């Protein structure tokens, strides 16, 4: 999370690529880490989808087994409207 100073939200325009979650993170919200009920499918930007992290867990980088969602509280607070929710290093 950030917290960290070199870490931040990509927030680039999301495209058609769908964020994933590993077995460990399944059900968890990409933004708040809660298990509030899933509300909207996570999409990531073309750059976050490229490379080593492709198809990997959007939260931890583990092997993706299911699609990531924003929870209902997050969609109410409009956290899905900011763009790509992946944490990046910069
Ligand atoms: Zn949430
Ligand atoms: Zn991104
Ligand atoms: Zn994970």
Numbering used by the authors: 2 to 91
Can you list sentences taken from the study reporting this PDB entry?
The SF3b core complex contains several spliceosome-associated proteins (SAPs), including SF3B1/SAP155, SF3B2/SAP145, SF3B3/SAP130, SF3B4/SAP49, SF3B5/SAP10, SF3B6/SAP14a and PHF5A/SAP14b. Here, by integrating structural and biochemical approaches with a modified chemogenomic strategy utilizing structurally different splicing modulators at permissive dosage for resistant mutation(s) mapping, we report that PHF5A, a core component of the SF3b complex, is a common cellular target of splicing-modulating chemical probes, including herboxidiene, pladienolide, spliceostatin and sudemycin. The full-length Rds3 protein was recently observed in the cryo-EM structure of the spliceosome Bact complex at a resolution range of 3.0–3.5 Å15. This structure shows that Rds3/PHF5A is a central scaffolding protein, interacting with Hsh155/SF3B1, Rse1/SF3B3, Ysf3/SF3B5, U2 snRNA and the intron RNA. In summary, we identify PHF5A as a key node of interaction for small-molecule splicing modulators.
We purified the WT protein and determined the crystal structure at 1.8 Å resolution. Our final model contains residues 2–93 out of 110 total. PHF5A forms a mushroom-like structure with a triangular-shaped cap and a stem composed of antiparallel strands from the N and C termini. The cap is formed by a left-handed, triangular, deep trefoil knot containing three zinc ions and five CXXC motifs, which are permuted between the zinc fingers. PHF5A contains 13 Cys residues and 12 of these coordinate 3 zinc ions in tetrahedral geometry. The remaining cysteine was mutated to serine (C40S) to enhance soluble protein expression. Interestingly, PHF5A incorporates three different types of zinc finger. Zinc-finger 1 (ZnF1) folds into a gag knuckle and has C4 coordination from the first and fourth CXXC motifs. Zinc-finger 2 (ZnF2) is formed by the second and fifth CXXC motifs. Zinc-finger 3 (ZnF3) is formed by the third CXXC motif from helix-η2 and two individual cysteines from the loops connecting the first and the last beta strands of the mushroom stem.
